[PDB]
């Protein structure tokens, strides 16, 4: 199981500067050496490289676009099978009720419980009711990952109104909740932990130097 | 000349997770894409890789330890020659009063003006008196890089007492001053820029995920 504490997301998609299984493995080692308790990573190859450099538990996803679906975080059994092969300890998937290319969310949850019974699952959700649906499906973890990143949560950011959305998720489910998405600073990390999340996933604030650089530059441009 | 704004230090020494000319070239790309106006980098190998990735001006150093000297930032003509070969726009060196392994600081300054007349020079100093000595030697930039990092500045950090050390440096010299050392947040970057530095160097806050991870973990340990 994931400990309490800091999960570092070590992702770099094609065309991002640090894109490379190798580099993500080194970002993960850096996170490990700074006191991270887990890693979140994207694609079987990045996960396998990371698992060569750290024994931290990994939350695995496959970001892959499908025609006629806005679901891209572990959309189908093809991505699930890649992640089972990766041996990541936790499989994260979009747990919205948006249209998927193939299996439904219920079918992907059954698929994972049948084919990878020792793997934990994590629901990336955007709304309280998606969170409650995930809790009902027996998700091990419910993350705020997609809050602000679906067509229907545009402009919503986890931290808004002192983490009201996070407070509402924590109030609505007994499952382990993960503060993920727009945890930008140590102060935000402390706040989500004090609000009672099991753990927090921090990505861009640690592993996206372009995004960190932009925050430094923006302070001069207000 | 270096513009006003943010210089990103893209360094990873041999024991650090990201040690690699290729990775530091990508950190530099990320800095560029985020709005940096320059790069500080270490070793000819890293500098050449960065200079083929971005056209941003580079402050080059070679960190290399010598016996019977505490000077490790561009200590001798050997490091200077590596930086001349690198074609970096600015050569930075330890510009402390500390005894060097070979040439004196004064000797090295003469050497650079002779052997690389088109290169600007940056004085990494620890004290106001070293800043004044650097102005004496005609340095183009005076950075606060070694303030707190010498045997005679123990316990001091750039930000202490609302950047009093930086205020004292800026009052002491007419040369372009660079805020470097422990500039860890956008707030600190804003502050040193508002105090009148030419530019600021931010390293670990952007390019050392281990260091950033430690600050996240640390807020849960206070
Ligand atoms: C919507 C989406 O794709 N999210 C990604 C999912 O893996 C990453 O953003 C991940 O959550 C990283 C943590 O977010 P941040 O960079 O700290 O804001
Ligand atoms: C004393 C020393 O070795 N300094 C290094 C000089 O290259 C780095 O610290 C460099 O100044 C980068 C700025 O420091 P930070 O990583 O932003 O805190
Ligand atoms: Cl980046
Ligand atoms: Cl690091």
Numbering used by the authors:
A (entry chain AAA), B (entry chain BBB): 1 to 222
Article sentences:
We aimed to examine the involvement of the C5 hydroxyl of ManNAc-6P in the catalytic mechanism. Two derivatives were synthesized with substitutions at the C5 hydroxyl: 5-deoxy-ManNAc-6P, with a substituted hydrogen, and 5-methyl-ManNAc-6P, with a substituted methoxy group. SaNanE was cocrystallized with these ligands to obtain ligand-bound structures. Unambiguous density for the N-acetyl and phosphate groups of the ligand was present in one of the monomers in the same position as in ManNAc-6P. The ligand was fit to an occupancy of 0.66 with phenix.refine, with citrate fitted to an occupancy of 0.34. The center of the ligand appears to bind in a different orientation to that of ManNAc-6P, notably with Glu180 interacting with the C4 hydroxyl of the substituted ligand. With the ability to form a hydrogen bond at the C5 position removed in 5-deoxy-ManNAc-6P, Glu180 has formed a short hydrogen bond (2.5 Å) with a different hydroxyl group. Mutagenesis studies identified the roles of Lys63 and Glu180, and crystallographic modeling highlighted the unusually short hydrogen bond between Glu180 and the substrate, which is retained even if the C5 hydroxyl of the substrate is removed (it now forms with the C4 hydroxyl).
The third step in the sialic acid catabolic pathway is mediated by the enzyme N-acetylmannosamine-6-phosphate 2-epimerase (NanE), which catalyzes an inversion of stereochemistry at the C2 position of N-acetylmannosamine-6-phosphate (ManNAc-6P), yielding N-acetylglucosamine-6-phosphate (GlcNAc-6P). The crystal structure of NanE from Staphylococcus aureus, which comprises a triosephosphate isomerase barrel fold with an unusual dimeric architecture, was solved with both natural and modified substrates. NanE is essential for the growth of S. aureus in media containing N-acetylneuraminic acid as the sole carbon source and has a highly conserved active site across both Gram-positive and Gram-negative bacteria. Based on our structural and kinetic data, we propose that NanE performs its epimerization reaction using a novel proton displacement mechanism mediated by the substrate.
